[PDB]
Design a protein around this motif. Structure first.
Motif, PDB file in Angstrom:
ATOM      1  N   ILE A  46       0.677 -15.841  -9.559  1.00 50.89           N
ATOM      2  CA  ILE A  46      -0.489 -15.262  -8.920  1.00 50.89           C
ATOM      3  C   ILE A  46      -0.143 -14.746  -7.786  1.00 50.89           C
ATOM      4  CG2 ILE A  46      -1.337 -17.453  -8.252  1.00 50.89           C
ATOM      5  CD1 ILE A  46      -3.591 -14.403  -8.941  1.00 50.89           C
ATOM      6  N   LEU A  47      -0.833 -13.611  -7.445  1.00 52.38           N
ATOM      7  CA  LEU A  47      -0.511 -12.715  -6.056  1.00 52.38           C
ATOM      8  C   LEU A  47      -1.757 -12.672  -5.462  1.00 52.38           C
ATOM      9  CD1 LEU A  47       1.382 -11.834  -3.936  1.00 52.38           C
ATOM     10  CD2 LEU A  47       1.384  -9.491  -4.935  1.00 52.38           C
ATOM     11  N   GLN A  48      -2.164 -13.163  -4.431  1.00 50.82           N
ATOM     12  CA  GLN A  48      -3.177 -12.899  -3.755  1.00 50.82           C
ATOM     13  C   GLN A  48      -3.113 -12.798  -2.199  1.00 50.82           C
ATOM     14  OE1 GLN A  48      -5.798 -16.228  -5.120  1.00 50.82           O
ATOM     15  NE2 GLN A  48      -7.002 -14.759  -6.599  1.00 50.82           N
ATOM     16  N   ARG A  49      -2.335 -11.913  -1.428  1.00 51.09           N
ATOM     17  CA  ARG A  49      -2.020 -11.867  -0.435  1.00 51.09           C
ATOM     18  C   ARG A  49      -3.180 -11.759   0.571  1.00 51.09           C
ATOM     19  NH1 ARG A  49       3.169 -13.298   0.731  1.00 51.09           N
ATOM     20  NH2 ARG A  49       4.778 -11.982  -0.674  1.00 51.09           N
ATOM     21  N   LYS A  50      -4.181 -11.174   0.038  1.00 49.39           N
ATOM     22  CA  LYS A  50      -5.463 -10.759   0.897  1.00 49.39           C
ATOM     23  C   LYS A  50      -6.450 -12.308   0.616  1.00 49.39           C
ATOM     24  CE  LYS A  50      -4.525  -6.975   2.626  1.00 49.39           C
ATOM     25  NZ  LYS A  50      -4.293  -6.705   3.742  1.00 49.39           N
ATOM     26  N   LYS A  51      -5.812 -12.992  -0.360  1.00 48.94           N
ATOM     27  CA  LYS A  51      -6.451 -14.349  -0.837  1.00 48.94           C
ATOM     28  C   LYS A  51      -7.648 -13.903  -1.259  1.00 48.94           C
ATOM     29  CE  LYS A  51      -4.602 -17.375   3.041  1.00 48.94           C
ATOM     30  NZ  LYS A  51      -4.497 -18.261   3.945  1.00 48.94           N
TER      31      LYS A  51
END
Length: 17
Positions: free
Chosen positions: A12-17
């Motif tokens: 899962i990629l959520q750089r901006k959360k």
């Protein structure tokens, strides 16, 4: 830009959360 964000991107990629 980088493939490094793959191993955890697949999880899962959520750089901006």
């Amino acid at each position: 830009e980088m493939r490094l964000s793959k191993f955890f991107r697949n999880f899962i990629l959520q750089r901006k959360k």
